[PDB]
Amino acid sequence: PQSYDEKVDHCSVIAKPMAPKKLSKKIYKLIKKSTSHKNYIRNGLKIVQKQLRLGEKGIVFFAGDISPIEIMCHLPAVCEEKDIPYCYTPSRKDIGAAMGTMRGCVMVLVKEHDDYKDLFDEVRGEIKLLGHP
Amino acid sequence: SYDEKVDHCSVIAKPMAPKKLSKKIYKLIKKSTSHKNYIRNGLKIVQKQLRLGEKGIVFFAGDISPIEIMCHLPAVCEEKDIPYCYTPSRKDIGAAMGTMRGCVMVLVKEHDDYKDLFDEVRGEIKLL
Amino acid sequence: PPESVIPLGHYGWTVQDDLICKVDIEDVPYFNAPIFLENKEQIGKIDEIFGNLRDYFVSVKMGDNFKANSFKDGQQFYIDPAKLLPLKRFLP
Amino acid sequence: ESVIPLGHYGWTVQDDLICKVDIEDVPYFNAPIFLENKEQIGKIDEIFGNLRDYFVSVKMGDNFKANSFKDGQQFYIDPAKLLPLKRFLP
Amino acid sequence: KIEPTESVTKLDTAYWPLLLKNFDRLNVRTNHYTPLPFGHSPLKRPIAEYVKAGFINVDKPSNPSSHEVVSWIKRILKVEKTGHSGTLDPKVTGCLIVCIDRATRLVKSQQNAGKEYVAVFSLHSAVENVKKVTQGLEKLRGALFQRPPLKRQLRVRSVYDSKLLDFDKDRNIGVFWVSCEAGSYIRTMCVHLGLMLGVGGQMIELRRVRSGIQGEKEGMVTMHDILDAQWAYENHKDESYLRRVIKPLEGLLVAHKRIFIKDSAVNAVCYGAKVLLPGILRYEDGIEIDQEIVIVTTKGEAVALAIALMTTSTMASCDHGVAAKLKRVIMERDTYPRKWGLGPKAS
Amino acid sequence: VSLGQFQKLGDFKIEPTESVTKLDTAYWPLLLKNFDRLNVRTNHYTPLPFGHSPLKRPIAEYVKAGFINVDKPSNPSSHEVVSWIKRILKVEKTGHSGTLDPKVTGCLIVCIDRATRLVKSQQNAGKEYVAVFSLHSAVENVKKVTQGLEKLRGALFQRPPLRQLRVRSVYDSKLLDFDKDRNIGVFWVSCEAGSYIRTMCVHLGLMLGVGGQMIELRRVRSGIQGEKEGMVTMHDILDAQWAYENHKDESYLRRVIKPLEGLLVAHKRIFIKDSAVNAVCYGAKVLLPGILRYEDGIEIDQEIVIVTTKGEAVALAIALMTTSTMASCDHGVAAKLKRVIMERDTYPRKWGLGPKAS
Amino acid sequence: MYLRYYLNENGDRQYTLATIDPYGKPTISAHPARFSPEDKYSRHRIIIKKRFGLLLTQQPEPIL
Amino acid sequence: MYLRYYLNENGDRQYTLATIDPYGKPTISAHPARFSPEDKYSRHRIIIKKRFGLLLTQQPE
RNA sequence: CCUGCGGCGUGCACGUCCCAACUGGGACGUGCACCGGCCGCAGGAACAGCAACGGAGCGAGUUGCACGUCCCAACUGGGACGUGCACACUCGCUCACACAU
């Protein structure tokens, strides 16, 4: 089965910061733990883009394997402008499994809620420490 | 040897049989010779039988020159859906047909005696 | 209805509910052009003409109670001689 | 009638008795040849060689043998069956 | 590689900008001419004249039409006119040459350009081997009958070459690359390849991989690049991105035979005068009568497209006359001064 | 800095002057080769837009004014080959210069409907053959055969094979191979037109003292055309015609057929103005007032080719003026027509409009 | 969509329907990103492209 | 038939009766294939030659 | 006077039958090629002209896409409500009428 050190090699050159393996487990758990509340986690390029435009705070998780990059290369900069932390994930299919829809989504917007306050805070802190190139 | 002979052949000598497939082809030709009307030998007879519509397998010899004497028959075989494959030399074909004289090409029909070998060679060629 | 008929060509193959005929006469048939039998029996209309400019084929849409399996190898087909153009017309 | 010297025996290509030619006139085809005593030994069969220094091979009858003549044996030919060399020159 | 101030001659003649390349390989009629300070090199034009005399090699998106991708560029660049030299279907991506303003004069000349597509074909039924598809593509070659997809004037168009790039048996979906003449309908070609193979088929995806001498490796830029270049120009006054995106029109005439004219003949040609022998500084081997040529200035600009009325040998053996008549003037009038009527006679 | 940056930042303009304008015409096709080296009489004339370059003609005119170097197949006769080409190309006329016996392969120049006027001029062309011979009885050793061949190098005597004894020359000869076990040899011969190499083989046999005969023959060169000079097979002609009649492709037919001017590349050239082409076609003698260029070395009563400035062979003529006279004269007939090759009305009638004529 | 590709040593497009190229690396899709004229993300795309060195200007210039 | 040939480095024909050239390769027969005017295999002959880069149009010059 | 044109039973290939190589043998039918001088027809009687009065540039005639807002069940396909965007000749105007030192 595909590893985590080769799957990362398969991503594009703009997938930075890229969550390490441990942080990757954390984000998948956060997405699964947050899929619960339907309206507190957005899915889709158009939806995430719209919510970012109107300014919904949270965390933005990208997919490392995207091509052509011109479909989402503008979102990292918008997140930087609006002070919305973000990171990339090694593969999109992993995210799709994280939501249990079998159709990997390029990006996910994870907001804050009481039920997963601790996991959300830990992931956000880890992401902030990772830094932006 | 075998690699050397395939080296000497002309550029249109494709698809080519390897050593094992060549032994099978010579065995098939040797077995088919026992029946007069079920093996066709020579340029004119093979060309005429292809025109009429006869079926089977066509085996060529790649060491022929000039190639304009046979360059068209591979395309005729393709049009009529007749499997074919080249072999390193004509002397080998002749030696397998009980004639020291060489044979440029041959056409083998299907007979119950050698159904298994003809069908093995056909499958091997079709996978090339 | 067909005052006269000339042999368009011979039989080709079948592609689903169509019968490709290899056309021998150089003249290029019309589209939606009736293809008849020897006895002036309309069987279908031309749908697609493909191939080179001197060795080409034509697909016909058997319509009024006709089948592809009806016809057989070596069968010949007719066409109205007035529903043709010269090869030169289409060519440069 | 009369004869003039054609040349000498040079070699033998089967029946043909090849006579080297020293004259500047080229004989005809099947032109009869005769020895010193005006005895016919054959007719001209072929005329090869360079334009000037050339040879003629003659076919003989059944009464004569090619080996019957020794090296240096000289031959006579008709002076009335010759062409000018200037005719065959360009 | 080369220091910024090295002399132009220090670089071999085979590395000059786009219409001066291999100028020494051309036949020299005369070297003597009086250079004028007017005109600009094709690649050193100001930004205001680069855009007007430029073309873009756009990678057309999937959904929009070709007339909508050309209107978009006109709106983005705020240019007065913009055209293209071959229509790509609304659902078909690939190369699209978009001429900007003064370059649109070449659109007609680019209509007959040979095209190269990469098509995806789905077969309704299955075939026994890929060799069947390869042979079918082989017999769908040369001049072929084609009907425009849903006028209906059966036309004859040539497929020069083709090559089955890939085939998936489980999906019964294949990819084939086709070299074809301008106007060829690859949708009809896929239908005919289906019919020929006895199973049927249709084209489910297309992508033009070359349009004439321009391809995907030759400076192909997405529409995002055009949009980004304009924003950089307006909000940053940087012409690096805009010059990368837009190329001079001389890049569309590099394959044309050349006839260099003196600076005294440029304006006359721009006013409708025919190219005349006394004004030819250099001419190229292989010029035949009724052949489209490009008139080039001494700086590499394209004065016009002309039809040759004298072969190379005729130019080499005559002292005067009409070397070529005009077909399409590209250069604007009054770019060079009026200097006709002051020749050796002037009588 | 990268070469692209230097191109975008450099001047790169043609220099105002170089002081020399030498032409390099050594690579120009057919009768335009070394066009600059020809003596230039005048540069003043008005070219006409009629006509094409020999290699860039339309297909109809290209075929009508072409020739083919055909590898003759072993069995048929030369006239069968000529007729077969006619039927394949659907051309009114076709001819050939040298006749190869039914069993002899090799070069065979076939003219097509306007190059047939050059068949007579090709009859005297030199011929190189490669011939196989068998000797009736064995010889001492190979040096004997080499000496025998060295004795048949001259204005030899040859009577046609199965009777007007002629004289034909054998310039060179070489024993390429000799297998002693079978007594079969292969020798290459350069010879004059009309020479019957079967007669040579029997004569070589006679010379060796054992006799001999010819088994095979293969013409390896007819004039300036040989095996490497674009020789094509009969299959090539048929395939080229089919590609042009089915796929409407001309590249194959253009590789097969070659312009008739390829047969006249060994002739000295006199280029004439486009106003004098139609006059020459109608029979007018090539007059000095219409000569643009000429090739040095022209002697009286010499065969030259009258050519247009496009490279088209208007005619074959026989000079009546030397190169020195043609440089030092202002009037007088430069050449006398021998064979008009160009079709009439290809160029317009422009004779009679000059100053002296009126 | 169906048409994907990879590159050889010469940087030439080899077209395939396969998601993994012969060398194991993923195949890049052959179609450009969808364009909308009312796109106000020019500055953001330039920032990111520049940060990762994917801008047209940053590449080596052509040799026209 | 008798005549055969092999090509030297320069490209000239070297004629010989031997089956094997000095370089170990076969010697090509000197004579062309027989011709039948009623040959209906022109299409089939251009396909095979084109496939293998032997057609005249595919050679240089 | 000059030129162009015309006249003054062997083999070959194919198809079909017998026998004993990229073959030679036989037979039957198809087609294809062969075993310098004079005359007739037609074209013209040629000293090879022409360093600008026809060219160019403009204008007219001969449903999908993107965005936003909602419903629903990937870089998505569906609906609705509005926004913007695309779907060779002649006839007129202007410029010169240019052999480029």
Side-chain angles (χ1 to χ4, degrees), chain E residues 150-219:
Chain E
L150 267 157
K151 293 179 179 179
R152 306 156 295 118
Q153 288 184 3
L154 183 63
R155 34 199 271 178
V156 198
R157 291 299 189 261
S158 311
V159 174
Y160 303 122
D161 213 333
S162 64
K163 179 182 242 310
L164 191 78
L165 281 153
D166 220 323
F167 198 88
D168 257 6
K169 183 178 179 180
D170 289 345
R171 285 167 147 173
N172 271 312
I173 295 177
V175 180
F176 74 90
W177 156 93
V178 47
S179 270
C180 49
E181 138 172 33
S184 288
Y185 298 100
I186 305 303
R187 178 162 289 143
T188 287
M189 208 209 155
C190 278
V191 163
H192 294 181
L193 169 66
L195 293 179
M196 282 272 241
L197 295 174
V199 292
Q202 65 178 347
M203 186 210 49
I204 44 147
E205 187 152 297
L206 196 63
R207 159 158 193 93
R208 204 202 271 160
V209 292
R210 158 175 322 253
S211 169
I213 76 167
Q214 306 283 344
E216 323 178 290
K217 291 174 65 175
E218 294 263 331

Side-chain angles (χ1 to χ4, degrees), chain E residues 19 26-27 29 253 256-262 265-266 269 275-277 279-285 287-288 291-298 301-304 306-312 315 322-325, chain F residues 14:
Chain E
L19 266 180
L26 299 201
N27 317 305
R29 184 186 137 89
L253 318 172
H256 283 46
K257 301 269 167 287
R258 283 170 287 161
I259 281 188
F260 281 78
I261 51 164
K262 290 167 176 184
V266 171
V269 153
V275 183
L276 302 185
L277 218 54
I280 286 185
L281 211 59
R282 217 157 300 206
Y283 51 109
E284 166 128 39
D285 280 314
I287 284 171
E288 280 82 28
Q291 170 161 3
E292 208 196 28
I293 59 165
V294 58
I295 313 312
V296 187
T297 71
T298 50
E301 306 181 53
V303 181
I307 304 267
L309 295 174
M310 290 193 342
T311 59
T312 290
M315 301 184 237
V322 183
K325 57 161 168 179
Chain F
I14 277 185

Side-chain angles (χ1 to χ4, degrees), chain E residues 7-251:
Chain E
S7 172
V8 307
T9 62
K10 288 187 181 179
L11 211 66
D12 53 292
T13 302
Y15 276 133
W16 280 34
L18 282 159
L19 266 180
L20 297 156
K21 170 158 324 203
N22 298 131
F23 80 85
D24 58 358
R25 265 182 183 174
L26 299 201
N27 317 305
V28 189
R29 184 186 137 89
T30 167
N31 325 85
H32 180 45
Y33 73 105
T34 76
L36 278 39
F38 308 74
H40 293 281
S41 185
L43 276 154
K44 301 206 321 308
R45 305 227 197 72
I47 187 43
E49 286 106 283
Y50 200 67
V51 172
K52 272 180 242 325
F55 80 94
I56 319 182
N57 198 335
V58 181
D59 206 357
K60 183 196 159 302
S62 210
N63 294 310
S65 167
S66 272
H67 304 269
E68 230 187 332
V69 159
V70 153
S71 272
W72 287 351
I73 290 152
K74 184 214 258 248
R75 193 154 83 54
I76 287 155
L77 298 176
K78 316 181 182 355
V79 295
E80 289 169 339
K81 162 143 38 203
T82 302
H84 65 114
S85 60
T87 294
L88 271 179
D89 283 325
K91 268 291 169 323
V92 170
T93 79
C95 309
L96 187 73
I97 268 70
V98 178
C99 309
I100 309 183
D101 220 321
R102 171 149 87 67
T104 64
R105 313 199 196 190
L106 303 182
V107 170
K108 239 61 169 212
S109 323
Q110 292 281 116
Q111 303 288 60
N112 249 301
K115 310 269 148 61
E116 274 182 272
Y117 301 77
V118 168
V120 191
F121 67 94
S122 77
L123 302 170
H124 305 89
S125 309
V127 290
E128 293 177 350
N129 198 22
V130 182
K131 291 174 65 175
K132 291 225 312 144
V133 173
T134 293
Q135 290 155 16
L137 258 161
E138 271 191 1
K139 55 184 51 154
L140 263 174
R141 187 153 332 161
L144 304 172
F145 287 113
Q146 249 153 213
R147 84 163 181 182
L150 267 157
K151 293 179 179 179
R152 306 156 295 118
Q153 288 184 3
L154 183 63
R155 34 199 271 178
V156 198
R157 291 299 189 261
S158 311
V159 174
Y160 303 122
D161 213 333
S162 64
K163 179 182 242 310
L164 191 78
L165 281 153
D166 220 323
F167 198 88
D168 257 6
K169 183 178 179 180
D170 289 345
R171 285 167 147 173
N172 271 312
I173 295 177
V175 180
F176 74 90
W177 156 93
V178 47
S179 270
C180 49
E181 138 172 33
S184 288
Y185 298 100
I186 305 303
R187 178 162 289 143
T188 287
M189 208 209 155
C190 278
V191 163
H192 294 181
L193 169 66
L195 293 179
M196 282 272 241
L197 295 174
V199 292
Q202 65 178 347
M203 186 210 49
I204 44 147
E205 187 152 297
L206 196 63
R207 159 158 193 93
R208 204 202 271 160
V209 292
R210 158 175 322 253
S211 169
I213 76 167
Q214 306 283 344
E216 323 178 290
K217 291 174 65 175
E218 294 263 331
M220 152 168 293
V221 306
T222 36
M223 287 277 281
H224 295 291
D225 287 359
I226 303 161
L227 194 80
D228 284 277
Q230 197 60 16
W231 176 96
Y233 178 67
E234 279 157 28
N235 301 49
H236 269 45
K237 328 292 184 289
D238 219 310
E239 319 155 342
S240 295
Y241 211 66
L242 208 47
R243 284 187 192 272
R244 296 296 232 118
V245 160
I246 298 168
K247 315 239 155 291
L249 66 94
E250 285 80 31

Side-chain angles (χ1 to χ4, degrees), chain F residues 152-353:
Chain F
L152 267 162
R153 298 179 67 247
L156 312 179
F157 258 120
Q158 283 179 349
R159 67 189 184 177
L162 267 157
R163 306 156 295 118
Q164 288 184 3
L165 177 53
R166 281 138 68 242
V167 201
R168 293 304 182 211
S169 317
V170 165
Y171 305 155
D172 266 1
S173 295
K174 184 169 203 206
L175 216 72
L176 275 56
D177 208 307
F178 201 99
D179 257 358
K180 183 178 179 180
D181 289 345
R182 333 179 275 169
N183 207 347
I184 297 200
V186 177
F187 80 91
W188 158 89
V189 61
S190 280
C191 47
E192 138 173 39
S195 77
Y196 303 100
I197 313 301
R198 202 190 283 284
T199 289
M200 182 170 336
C201 276
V202 60
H203 291 356
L204 171 147
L206 286 176
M207 214 77 55
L208 298 215
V210 317
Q213 86 203 331
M214 176 178 89
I215 322 131
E216 287 187 350
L217 194 59
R218 157 153 194 89
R219 200 198 260 161
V220 289
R221 150 174 313 270
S222 178
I224 35 177
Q225 320 270 350
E227 305 184 276
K228 291 174 65 175
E229 297 287 319
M231 185 192 280
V232 306
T233 55
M234 294 285 293
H235 292 119
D236 296 12
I237 302 163
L238 198 68
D239 303 16
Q241 183 61 21
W242 184 91
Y244 171 78
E245 246 194 337
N246 279 242
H247 305 354
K248 278 296 164 174
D249 213 35
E250 328 195 317
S251 178
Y252 207 168
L253 244 194
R254 287 191 188 278
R255 298 292 191 99
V256 159
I257 308 182
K258 289 138 273 164
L260 78 87
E261 289 83 17
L263 293 161
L264 311 169
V265 307
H267 290 73
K268 299 323 188 24
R269 295 160 299 188
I270 286 188
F271 282 78
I272 52 159
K273 294 168 186 172
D274 296 14
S275 316
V277 180
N278 221 21
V280 154
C281 291
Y282 276 55
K285 307 187 162 61
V286 199
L287 307 158
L288 224 54
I291 286 184
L292 290 166
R293 305 195 168 192
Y294 45 99
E295 204 165 345
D296 61 356
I298 280 169
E299 328 289 347
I300 281 284
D301 300 344
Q302 185 183 288
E303 180 89 317
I304 64 188
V305 62
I306 305 304
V307 200
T308 41
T309 278
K310 302 211 195 58
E312 322 190 87
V314 198
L316 278 170
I318 301 208
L320 338 147
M321 282 197 182
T322 326
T323 282
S324 312
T325 285
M326 272 180 359
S328 79
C329 266
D330 272 320
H331 72 104
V333 185
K336 135 170 62 52
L337 259 290
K338 166 186 183 25
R339 198 56 163 116
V340 160
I341 306 155
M342 183 156 274
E343 217 95 54
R344 322 190 163 204
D345 278 41
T346 294
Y347 284 71
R349 290 187 179 184
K350 301 257 183 31
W351 69 78
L353 325 161

Side-chain angles (χ1 to χ4, degrees), chain F residues 84-145:
Chain F
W84 293 355
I85 287 155
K86 209 171 117 166
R87 278 194 326 132
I88 289 163
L89 298 170
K90 288 150 289 253
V91 282
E92 301 99 271
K93 170 78 91 53
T94 173
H96 65 307
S97 56
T99 302
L100 296 158
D101 303 35
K103 239 67 172 52
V104 179
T105 55
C107 265
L108 186 50
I109 301 332
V110 180
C111 304
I112 318 198
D113 212 329
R114 232 182 68 208
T116 294
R117 323 207 199 182
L118 301 189
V119 167
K120 199 261 216 164
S121 78
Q122 289 286 298
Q123 259 153 21
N124 299 33
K127 263 98 194 188
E128 305 189 9
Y129 302 91
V130 172
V132 199
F133 66 88
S134 167
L135 302 172
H136 295 146
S137 287
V139 291
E140 276 186 355
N141 69 306
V142 186
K143 293 179 179 179
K144 185 63 68 177
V145 189

Side-chain angles (χ1 to χ4, degrees), chain D residues 2-87:
Chain D
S2 68
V3 289
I4 51 171
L6 174 65
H8 58 277
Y9 166 98
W11 66 97
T12 183
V13 194
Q14 293 133 27
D15 281 33
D16 266 310
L17 203 72
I18 186 69
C19 319
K20 197 159 187 176
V21 163
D22 286 315
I23 60 170
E24 280 194 352
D25 262 32
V26 175
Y28 305 176
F29 286 117
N30 329 97
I33 315 304
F34 329 87
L35 284 164
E36 190 179 357
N37 61 356
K38 294 175 184 172
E39 198 176 1
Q40 188 178 1
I41 52 171
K43 51 187 181 177
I44 279 189
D45 193 60
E46 208 159 6
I47 315 193
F48 63 82
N50 212 319
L51 178 55
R52 288 172 170 174
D53 154 26
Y54 82 92
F55 317 71
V56 153
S57 90
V58 300
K59 257 178 69 70
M60 323 162 297
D62 303 330
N63 279 322
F64 295 97
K65 292 179 184 177
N67 34 250
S68 78
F69 306 86
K70 299 176 182 176
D71 289 345
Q73 168 56 30
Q74 193 270 14
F75 310 96
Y76 272 110
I77 194 166
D78 183 23
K81 293 283 184 184
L82 294 173
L83 299 313
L85 194 277
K86 290 177 181 179
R87 181 177 181 170

